[PDB]
Structures are given as C-alpha cells and as structure tokens.
Amino acid sequence: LGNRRIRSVGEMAENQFRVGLVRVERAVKERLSLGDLDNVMPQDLINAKP
DNA sequence: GCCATTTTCGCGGCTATTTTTTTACTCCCAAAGTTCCGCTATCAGTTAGTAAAAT
Secondary structure (H helix, E strand, O other), rough: OOOOOOOOHHHHHHHHHHHHHHHHHHHHHHHHHHOOOOOOHHHHOOOOOO
C-alpha cells in the first residue's frame, strides 16, 4: 500500500478540467498567431464547450 | 540450410436485473429543380324524388 495510491473526486475533476483547458489552449494559440487583435477581447478567444 | 529466438495471432463460463450522450463551424450569387396553394373538370358514388307495381 506504499506503492498504491488513492485518487479521489477532486484529482479526477482537476485532470479532466486540465484536459479541457489544453483543448481550448490549442485554439487560443492558433487565433493569437493570426495577429489582428485590435478588436479581440478575451471572451472572444475562449470556447467553453470543450 | 538447419536450430534457435523473436514476433504476431487468437483465446480467456452461463443465465438474469438496474440504464441514451457531450470539441472542432465563411459567405454570396445565379441557375435549376421541386413543392404548395389554388382552380378546373370529370367520374363515381350517394341521396332525394317520383312513378311503377303490388297489396
């Protein structure tokens, strides 16, 4: 039991939330690479559906 | 060219009963085929009326 670990609700929720964050980070980087950001606000960059 | 070693391939019990999942995204225009409402017109069925027949 020193080589086996307990992983509970908080850890799993954090892992899946980080997965979603990576999913949106890819698209955020892709958009920020374009350059035309004069009228771009942060809420126009983030898609919460993933 | 045969003897051994590494790599795929296929397998791992039977009946029941509780319950769906989830990202990602241009626009416009001209040309063409299809549909939906309205009207017509014909035929067949139904129904009302009247004469023919029978009591």
